[PDB]
RNA sequence: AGCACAGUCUUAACGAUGGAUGUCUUGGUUCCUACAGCGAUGAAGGCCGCAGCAAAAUGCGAUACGCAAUGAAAAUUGCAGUGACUGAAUCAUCAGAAUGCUGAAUGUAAACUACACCAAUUCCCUGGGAAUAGUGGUACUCCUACAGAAA
RNA sequence: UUGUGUUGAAGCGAAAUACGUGAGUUUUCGUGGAACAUCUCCCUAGUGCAGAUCUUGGUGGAAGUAGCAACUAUUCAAAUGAGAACUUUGAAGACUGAAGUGGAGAAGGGUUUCUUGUCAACUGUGAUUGAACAAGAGUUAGCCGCUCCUAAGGGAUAGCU
RNA sequence: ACGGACCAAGGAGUCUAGCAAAUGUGCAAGUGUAUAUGAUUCUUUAAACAUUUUACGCAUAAUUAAUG
RNA sequence: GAUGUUAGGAGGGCAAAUCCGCCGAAUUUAAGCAUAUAAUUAAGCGGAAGAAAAGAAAAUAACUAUGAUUCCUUUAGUAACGGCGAGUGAACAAGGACCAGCUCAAACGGUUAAUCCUUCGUUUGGUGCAAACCUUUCGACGGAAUUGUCGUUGAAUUAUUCCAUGAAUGCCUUUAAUUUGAGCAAAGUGAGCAGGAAUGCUUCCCCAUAGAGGGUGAAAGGCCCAUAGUUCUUUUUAAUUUAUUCAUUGGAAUUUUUCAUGUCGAGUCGUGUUCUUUGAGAUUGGAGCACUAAUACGUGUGAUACAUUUCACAUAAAGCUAAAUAUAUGUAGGAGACCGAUAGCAAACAAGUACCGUGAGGGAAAGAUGAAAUAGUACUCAGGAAUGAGCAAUUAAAUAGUACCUGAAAUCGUUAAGAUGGAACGGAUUAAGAGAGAAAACAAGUAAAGAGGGGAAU
């Protein structure tokens, strides 16, 4: 959000009927270039917005837990089958099925490079490489805003 | 939402569809319930008829506590 | 990356470089050790000293080797006797080079240097 | 140049002996410096910087033997006591925040909270 | 007002951006106090921190039926369990002296759950291996041996609730 | 070596003026978190000063862009100059020392660097030996204790 | 999601045997020198300008025009200088006419004072001049004033509100 | 008849509360898990996940000033 | 009572976002307006804290009853108030966060103020280099106090059981957590291309508990800082380790046996009236004035004024108290579907600055060379100089030359082409010129020779 008094924190008057100026506030004095200029409005310079944004917008959204559920249920299922998944982005063309399940002792390895040499010998080899190579610093003002890169989900 | 909205269909149509010889000006009818009885009284005869007077004794405090009961059929 | 007292925003480090003061400077300024060094003293990398053999392997220079003259941390340079240029006027100026564009083949010997080296173990 | 370490065995008197000739050194440097003579217009920055280092020694042995004398006694000057926040020293003492009457020093000794567990 | 719709009622004709206020931090106040009460259970060095209250009923004919947690135990109840008040606040009873006990079923109930917890109850010495009978109904100190094999033990929270 | 009428208008190419656009960003904004009083032991605020060459800003207070101490620790530089082969050059920390005139401002005043009264005062050596017109104190209200006067 | 960039991105100028009906889209050349798009689908908004005597900034025709008009008045020769109607010197003709562009002060100003340089801008023409710019310097009290006294009056103390 | 000398940039139905209708979605005589709690979640995470077999709202019954 | 430059102390001012008192509008809404609303708000005055304030029932209920305060969900836009118009608007119960209770007065103690303070001394041990600090109980003196400090919470009496007490001897270990400051911290500066310069593109290697970010001559996990992780160090705080002999000094809880039903806040409550405030309505609280109580069998609430009376619940007129709560302030961190120099704070910069006003106050504009100025334009010619030009010169680049990234439009210049009888532009249709153009706007294949690229076949 905006500053509360952003641009109106001026002295208000719009002496302007008989000046041949319009009829807009302007900032009182003289002996600076403000003097005279149009104030707060949002057609003014430094005049502050039309409808300057407030922390009370509705940010979130309640979302029903039985939608929720249904939602969380339809992506499981969606996962479990292959044409989605090749669609989606995915490059499983060489997995054997695509609701893959691995042995426990997957949850037991501790490097990484034995995690990417798992991954490769499943076949997802191209989907590592898509992934290794998809970053890329993003477009606009963005990677100003800490967001620099961009990176594809595997 | 704010691209779904009417007022974007309306973007060069200088009156943003509220009227050429009406115009939209600021509480042309006054605010609120202002007219009730006066100049907005057939809106409030016709959609709410029982609106003014009062009936009935006062209960000072009530304790919806103490009526409380739920039926059953 | 995953503790959250230290700040990962650009803005913030990247004041936070251009005005440090001159002793975090210093540590700023350190630079790779060449391999038989980097094994000698079993460490990666070093700040450089003054009077430091050096081998700039970055930019147009990226050949010769030569001793280090003089430290700028005011601009974040380094100057080898060497790598000299001249200028329109008609004399002669050191050429700035980034820390991180040469690796230390030798490195003179001072009595904290050790002692940080040995901190090293 | 004088370092802040060697001449913190002197006595007083040629502290302010040494404090005296240094100043009068840079009367003289000013001097010259007015004067056209601009050779010595460095030395300045030093002289003037032993001139503080000399009377940092010399105030701080003021400071500690005078100290010395007001040790204990209970009443010392406002400068020697303590220079806490005005509302710190103003504060009621941890003794008494924490002092008791009998009875309910009795009811605390006789009854204090206890430490137990469960099945 | 215009069409078939309600009669307008906004209760907004004062200055009401001064007074709105949204409540950003709430998951993050959860976590604090669950955290701040956390420290408080470890700190305490095994004594759980809840009190134990009583099971009092609902006023009203609305909640007639319903018991919940109530403030303290009374005197009475107290004494049923043999326990003076002054030394059940000592053993995280909790006590207030405005409640009566209007009713003998409510008198028993109550005394029969301070025996239970009373007899869950296993002091810890306050002198470190000086164990003793207690005073004023609390029990006498457990020994090193069962404090040792009961400070391992999974502490029973279900009588506070 | 010669030839175009001039002006006005249109078009293109190249330029002037101008500072849009794009891209930048040690800035802002909002939220979250945490701590939270400073002052007669003289605050906040205001003046006045302080560097070798020095206006502003920043920093500092007659020890005046910094002293001492502690950690790091070789540079610092426009010139001049200062530094070890680490209490030294420069950072950081900052507990010691120092902290001008004011300001609640409080001896009386105030478009005054004006005027009081009381102690003379300060320093050096371990009872002397010096130097200073310099240094402290003196508001109003109130509390506790004390004093001698009162009915 | 899947792409374009130092073998040159965004932007910009001119364009195109280009597409669309149209908002537009896409390409070429030049310039540019560091980022850009996603139309696969969706999410979001401070999202689309010819006007509001709109706001800010910039720029026109008017126009080399209106105008540079109070205070009677200038001339000759020389010096300096790149350059002299308005800098200096000499000569002449005149003015101010002790109710003075003459001497002293107050209020106000604050270094404009002096000397030496000096001309980017200013000195509405010129300018080598200057109250401009730059570097230095300059204000000396027992007797002149303040300081003291009291006035119209102000503030404050004791009370009392 | 009024505004517009010219150009660039900025420039105006939005945000929140509350109600209704419409439509999509989930469940259905039920629906919404409020505040809060737990939990090997704690960059993201201020979100996601969860809720020992009569809390509360709306609906499930209306009508009357009212005892009902 | 005064008075004291007697001794020791305190208050004063700044700062306010949250907080506590007072005082107190109008704009506005009612489509006018006067009650009402705005609003118990803004402005004004005063006073505190890291929170403040409230708070331990003269409470609620009417039930099978609850049990200090505060806050959240809800009750509930409800009961109610209101030209019953516009509008306004609580409380109880319920679910949660948090959870804590207390002391004066009054009673009782006179074979004895058993209290308190000032000043001057004594030691009991400890962490500090020091400076200083924490514990310590024996006094003595001078006072205050009976116009009342301190002890008990009725007083004794048995029974058990607890708690503080001293001396001597020994014991000071381990671990988990929490919290500061420090270190250590993987892997390429490998070819080749194009470059001023790789961090780019191809290609060959790897590290990853590190592929967060920043810097580095262009886009870097492997060049540097740092990051993941880990090791020391600081704060406190749990569990764990060990305590043993002797002694008397006092206190406490409950339980036996008797007394006496004690005390319990006065110009206060309350009532009348006036004003205000509230949803509070024959008055919700407060205030002013008048009148002015009872003594626990009392008196106060039980939301309609009375009289007689049951019942229930509390025990006013004295005081303290942590937590859950709030924070447009200050400081310090961390973030973001935020703004990107006419935006975002007024201020990205020497910004509350320059400047304006007598004053209260008003209040700007202004970011960008380049990788590197440790490359900021050397030299020559012409000019008095500014400048210009070069066969001269830095750079990758000077049409990047300090107003320096890009460099639009308005407006103006140069050159070329065209038009030109009191508007100019334009629509529709062609024609004539001038620019550009081959992607349909002809020619697949075929044979030969030259340069290449691939695929399959052992």
């Known amino acids: 959000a905006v500053k509360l008094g952003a641009g109106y924190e001026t002295s208000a008057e719009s002496w302007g009927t008989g000046r041949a100026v319009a009829r807009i506030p302007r900032v009182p004095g003289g002996g600076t270039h403000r003097a005279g200029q149009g104030a707060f409005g949002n057609m003014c310079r430094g005049g502050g917005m039309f409808n300057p944004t407030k922390i009370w917008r509705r940010w979130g959204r309640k979302v029903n837990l039985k939608e929720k559920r249904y939602a969380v249920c339809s992506s499981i299922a969606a996962s479990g089958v292959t044409s989605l998944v090749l669609a989606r982005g995915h490059r499983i063309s060489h997995l054997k099925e695509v609701p893959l399940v691995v042995s426990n002792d997957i949850e037991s390895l501790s490097k990484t490079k034995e995690a990417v040499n798992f991954l490769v010998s499943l076949g997802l080899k191209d989907e590592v490489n898509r992934l290794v190579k998809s970053k890329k610093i993003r477009a606009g003002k963005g990677k100003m805003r800490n967001r620099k890169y961009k990176i594809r989900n595997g | 939402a704010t691209r779904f909205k009417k007022n974007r269909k309306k973007r060069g149509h200088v009156s943003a569809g509220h009227g050429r010889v009406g115009k939209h000006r600021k509480h042309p009818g006054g605010r609120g319930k202002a007219g009730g009885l006066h100049h907005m009284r057939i809106n409030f005869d016709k959609y709410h008829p029982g609106y003014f007077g009062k009936v009935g004794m006062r209960h000072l405090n009530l304790l919806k506590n103490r009526t409380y009961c739920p039926t059953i059929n | 990356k995953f503790n959250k007292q230290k700040s990962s925003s650009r803005r913030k480090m990247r004041k936070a470089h251009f005005t440090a003061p001159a002793g975090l400077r210093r540590k700023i300024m350190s630079s790779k050790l060449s391999k038989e060094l980097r094994l000698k003293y079993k460490t990666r990398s070093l700040p450089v000293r003054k009077d430091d053999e050096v081998l700039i392997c970055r930019g147009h220079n990226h050949g010769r080797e030569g001793k280090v003259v003089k430290i700028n941390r005011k601009r974040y340079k380094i100057y080898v006797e060497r790598v000299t240029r001249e200028k329109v006027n008609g004399e002669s100026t050191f050429i700035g080079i980034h820390p991180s564009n040469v690796v230390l083949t030798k490195l003179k010997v001072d009595k904290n240097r050790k002692k940080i080296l040995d901190r090293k173990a | ?119 | 007002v215009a069409h078939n719709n309600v009669l307008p009622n906004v209760h907004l004709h004062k200055w009401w951006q001064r007074h709105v206020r949204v409540n950003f931090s709430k998951n993050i106040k959860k976590k604090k106090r669950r955290l701040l009460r956390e420290k408080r259970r470890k700190a305490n060095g095994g004594t759980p921190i809840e009190k134990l209250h009583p099971i009092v009923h609902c006023p009203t004919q609305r909640y007639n039926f319903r018991t919940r947690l109530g403030k303290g135990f009374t005197f009475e109840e107290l004494k049923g369990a043999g326990l003076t008040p002054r030394a059940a606040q000592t053993i995280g009873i909790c006590y207030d002296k405005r409640r009566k006990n209007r009713s003998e079923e409510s008198l028993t109930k109550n005394v029969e759950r301070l025996l239970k917890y009373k007899n869950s109850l296993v002091m810890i010495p306050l002198k470190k291996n000086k164990a003793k009978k207690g005073i004023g109904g609390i029990p006498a100190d457990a020994d090193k041996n069962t404090i040792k094999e009961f400070r391992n033990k999974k502490p029973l929270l279900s009588i506070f609730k």
Do not use: C, W
């Open chain 4, 1 to 119: 140049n004088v370092k802040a370490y060697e001449l913190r065995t002197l006595k007083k008197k040629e502290l302010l002996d040494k404090l005296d000739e240094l100043k009068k050194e840079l009367s003289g440097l000013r001097i010259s410096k007015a004067l056209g003579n601009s050779a010595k217009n460095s030395k300045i920055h030093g002289v003037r910087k032993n001139v503080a280092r000399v009377l940092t020694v010399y105030n701080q042995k003021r400071k500690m033997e005078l100290r010395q004398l007001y040790k204990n006694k209970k009443f010392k000057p406002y400068n020697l006591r303590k220079k806490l926040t005005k509302n710190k020293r103003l504060q009621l003492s941890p003794k008494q925040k924490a002092a008791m009457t009998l009875r309910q020093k009795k009811k605390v000794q006789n009854f204090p909270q206890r430490k137990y567990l469960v099945v």
